[PDB]
Amino acid sequence: MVQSSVLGFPRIGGQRELKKITEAYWSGKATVEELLAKGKELREHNWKLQQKAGVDIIPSNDFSYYDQVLDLSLLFNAIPERYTKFDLAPIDVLFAMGRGLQTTATTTQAAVDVTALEMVKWFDSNYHYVRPTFSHSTEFKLNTAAGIKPVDEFNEAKALGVQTRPVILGPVSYLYLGKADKDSLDLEPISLLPKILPVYKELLQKLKEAGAEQVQIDEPVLVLDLPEAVQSKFKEAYDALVGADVPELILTTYFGDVRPNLKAIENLPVAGFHFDFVRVPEQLDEVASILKDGQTLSAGVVDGRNIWKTDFAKASAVVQKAIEKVGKDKVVVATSSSLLHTPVDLESETKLDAVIKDWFSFATQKLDEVVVIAKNVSGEDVSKQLEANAASIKARSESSITNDPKVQERLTTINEALATRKAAFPERLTEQKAKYNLPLFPTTTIGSFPQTKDIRINRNKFAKGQITAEEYEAFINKEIETVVRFQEEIGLDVLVHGEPERNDMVQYFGEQLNGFAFTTNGWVQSYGSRYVRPPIIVGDVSRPKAMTVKESVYAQSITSKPMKGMLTGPVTILRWSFPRDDVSGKIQALQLGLALRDEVNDLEGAGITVIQVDEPAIREGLPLRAGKERSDYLNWAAQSFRVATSGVENSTQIHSHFCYLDPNHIKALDADVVSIEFSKKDDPNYIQEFSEYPNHIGLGLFSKQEFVSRIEEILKVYPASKFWVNPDCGLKTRGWPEVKESLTNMVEAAKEFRAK
């Protein structure tokens, strides 16, 4: 009776096949044919997977060798002229767009070195897409040359007897998520809707002309705060596509709240809508009302971005809540977003203890979840599944892993006091000058040093258990002292240890905290072929033993100069994980802050009184719409950082580093120093911007002359008593002969300013 849907499936493979064959192809060690073949093998595998599973609406064109948005750009001829002046073939021009083309010179052709198009975070997901990139010259048209991807693949699956609903991005989200190319900075992308809509119609005709009665059209910018110049175009664009010679259209949104844009899409000639009810369940009533008799409502109720075993009772209730408002015949049960944002299969999980594996459910498991739910509401008997599922829910609600009594009592202790330093900055600053008697324009470093073949082989051979613990505790010291001496030679004032002992700035902390579980194949596609294996916060978080004390303490004891302890902020640790979904992001960020505070304490007690704490993840986890949520997030974000840093003596100096950060947040941290990255361009937007920050600032510019020059114009607006000097972020990814030069040039510049 009630159909089940899936908006998309991860194409990387269960054994990361896609990473293997694509990297292969780029590296000369596999042929186009072999790629395509493997591609065909996964699409086929996954199509069949979903069918065996019971899924009724199964997606096609959801697969990509790199990125779906990029496929669309290639299919509509949104292809900057540069990538054609290279006699390259289709799928090659496609990779060149997303990865770049660097050739050694010849005698015929020069040294072509075209860079790749901008990589943009897909909303607030962990996925990244190629920014669509248009010129004034841009001539939109279907590339029948390369073949019509979405059609070729709809057939392919038809062939295997799988009738799929092709997924493509709507023309509105596509244009609005794009940008003007280099040679047209005046161009507004949404201006182009009239140039593109034809191309869309034509592709929608070939799909129909090939047996696609259904097409899922993606328009998730609808969950964003949109201009009128955009939201007024949905009417224009969808009156233009629908008709008899094209498939029915399902307008799909996910990730957020479409309410504020309802009136932009309440009079649309489409067959139905998909709404994310996992993220915004509250929005049920409003959205469903805009439906007109005949229109269908896809009810995303199985999470497509997390890994929790869905709670069928509630998920069903939500679907029912929707059914008893548009009718059993018009509701479709669906994953909330594409399953792209989920790992492939919980079965590949070997080390994971079963009791917790019992709470999980990756992409594969999720297919069986929409199907069991679609039945449940359909009225068929699935009492066996329900009883079982209900139990995993109880198992998890009552498990000790999820209710840490000591942590819960500790949350009680969170108040204004605990979120505030013992004295304001100007007072602390008095004590700190007394402790450190540093010079004007103090020099310092930010993070990792360039990493040697051994530094990595070592850590590796220590996990892979091929080397003694003494052999290892030794190697790291030998790099630590090497990095400490190096710094004293160039002449830095405050030093870092070099972090030879650390791997992921999150994984490294995760493994040392309670409430964290890890996977062996929990891979999620991130950009191109780079995947990630996020930790999973599976319960109440706490710190049992110290995490970073030992290596910092050794480094400090071999130099008279202040040593920096290096931590990661609670919010970034939360963002770069799979969060619990039984408790608020705020409550998990607070627990993490509580745990980090134990670490910060223990660093201080050990004579590490200069502690750096990074949150490169703040803008990333910024709620998609301005409003009450966005503002609150910014509060508990600063609150989380302060809870982790507000127990230190005034003499103890808390730093924080930023590359990408959020002027509100920074202001509310109360960091003794914030080191920021500046550019020669966004300077007018940057400099003036920190007439704000009350406290000290690490001006990170990025020649000894061009350093002075730079600093000089910053001192035409600020007191020199405010600033430390430091590198950008891009020194970790730089060679020693480069570092030694830059780090010496910078140190030298700030030497000139002490003389003056």
Q: Which residues contact 232 (CB under 8 A, 6 or more apart)?
A: 264
Q: Read off the tokens for 422.
A: 């013992």
Question: Nearest 5°: phi and psi at 569?
Answer: -70, 160
Question: Nearest 5°: phi and psi at 45?
Answer: -50, -50
Torsion of CA 679, 682, 684, 688, to 10 degrees: -80
CATH fold of the domain at 399-519+535-756: TIM Barrel (3.20.20)
Place of tokens 């849907």: 5
The per-residue DSSP string of 251-308 comes to: EE--SS--GGGGGGSSS---SEEEEETTT-GGGHHHHHHT--TT-EEEEEEE-SS--B
Place of tokens 């590490």: 608
Of 122, 140, 138, which Cα lies nearest the Cα of 130? 122
Q: Read off the tokens for 450.
A: 């360039």
CB 60 within 8 A of CB 166: yes
Of 653, 707, 715, which Cα lies nearest the Cα of 687? 715
- Check residue 163 and report its DSSP letter: -
Looking at residue 260, its amino acid is P
Cα separation, 541 vs 538, whole angstroms: 9
Cα separation, 20 vs 11, whole angstroms: 12
Of 78, 77, 83, 49, which Cα lies nearest the Cα of 63? 49
Kindly report the CATH number that applies to the domain delimited by 1-398+520-534.
3.20.20.210
Indicate the domain borders of the chain: 1-398+520-534, 399-519+535-756
Burial label, 670 (beta-carbon count in 10 A; 0-12, 13-18, 19+): buried
Dmax (CA) of the chain: 84
CB 144 within 8 A of CB 542: no
Domains 1-398+520-534 and 399-519+535-756 fall in the same CATH topology:
yes
- Check residue 385 and report its DSSP letter: H
Of 658, 688, 655, 686, which Cα lies nearest the Cα of 673? 655
Cα separation, 9 vs 165, whole angstroms: 13
Looking at residue 380, its amino acid is E
Q: Read off the tokens for 376.
A: 């449940």
Count the alpha carbons within 13 Å of 583 in the hemisphere toward its beta carbon.
20
Of 222, 205, 198, 207, which Cα lies nearest the Cα of 165? 207
CB 199 within 8 A of CB 153: no
Cα separation, 16 vs 173, whole angstroms: 29
Q: β-strand 296-302 against 272-276: which pairing, if any?
A: parallel
Overall resolution, Å? 2.8
Q: β-strand 179-180 against 248-252: which pairing, if any?
A: unpaired
Question: Nearest 5°: phi and psi at 215?
Answer: -140, 125
In order of 302, 328, 382, 608, 643, the CA distances from 378 in angstroms are: 16, 7, 10, 62, 49
How many CB atoms lie under 10 A from the CB of residue 756? 7
Length of the chain: 756
Return contacts of 242-247, CB within 8 angstroms, 24+ apart. 242/269, 242/270, 245/205, 245/208, 245/209, 246/201, 246/204, 246/205, 246/207, 246/208, 246/215, 247/166, 247/204, 247/207, 247/208, 247/212, 247/213, 247/214, 247/215
Of 75, 672, 81, which Cα lies nearest the Cα of 425? 672
Of 208, 59, 72, 198, which Cα lies nearest the Cα of 131? 72
Cα separation, 517 vs 505, whole angstroms: 16
CB 552 within 8 A of CB 563: yes
Of 222, 223, 200, which Cα lies nearest the Cα of 268? 222
Cα separation, 242 vs 263, whole angstroms: 19
Q: β-strand 331-335 against 58-60: which pairing, if any?
A: unpaired
Sign of the alpha-carbon torsion through 424, 426, 430, 436: positive
The per-residue DSSP string of 633-696 comes to: HHHHHHHHHHHHHTTS-TTSEEEEE-----HHHHHTT--SEEEEEE-SSSHHHHGGGGSS--SE
Residues of each annotated binding site: 19, 126, 446-448, 499, 504, 527, 530-531, 576, 614, 657, 659, 677, 729
Residues of each annotated binding site for 5-methyltetrahydropteroyltri-L-glutamate: 19, 126, 504, 527, 530-531, 576
**443 pairs with which residues across the strands?**
725
Cα separation, 334 vs 636, whole angstroms: 32
In order of 159, 344, 495, 684, 747, the CA distances from 722 in angstroms are: 68, 50, 19, 18, 17
Of 215, 217, 170, 203, which Cα lies nearest the Cα of 57? 215
| Helix 736-755, helix 469-490: angle, nearest 10 | 40
Count the alpha carbons within 13 Å of 28 in the hemisphere toward its beta carbon.
0
Question: Nearest 5°: phi and psi at 277?
Answer: -95, 5
Cα separation, 1 vs 697, whole angstroms: 63
Of 278, 282, 313, 299, which Cα lies nearest the Cα of 397? 313
Q: Supply the Cα-derived Rg of the chain in whole angstroms.
A: 28
Q: Which residues contact 179 (CB under 8 A, 6 or more apart)?
A: 118, 131, 132, 133, 134, 189
Question: Nearest 5°: phi and psi at 514?
Answer: -70, 150
Cα separation, 196 vs 528, whole angstroms: 26
Residues of each annotated binding site for L-homocysteine: 446-448, 499, 614
Of 194, 178, 190, which Cα lies nearest the Cα of 69? 178
Question: Nearest 5°: phi and psi at 243?
Answer: 155, -175
Alpha helices in 497-647 (DSSP H): 507-510, 549-556, 570-575, 585-605, 628-645
In order of 67, 593, 613, 654, the CA distances from 414 in angstroms are: 44, 10, 20, 20
Place of tokens 């023309």: 171
Q: Read off the tokens for 115.
A: 């860079």
Residues of each annotated binding site for Zn(2+): 657, 659, 677, 729
Residues of each annotated binding site for L-methionine: 446-448, 499, 614
**Structural biology method used:** X-ray
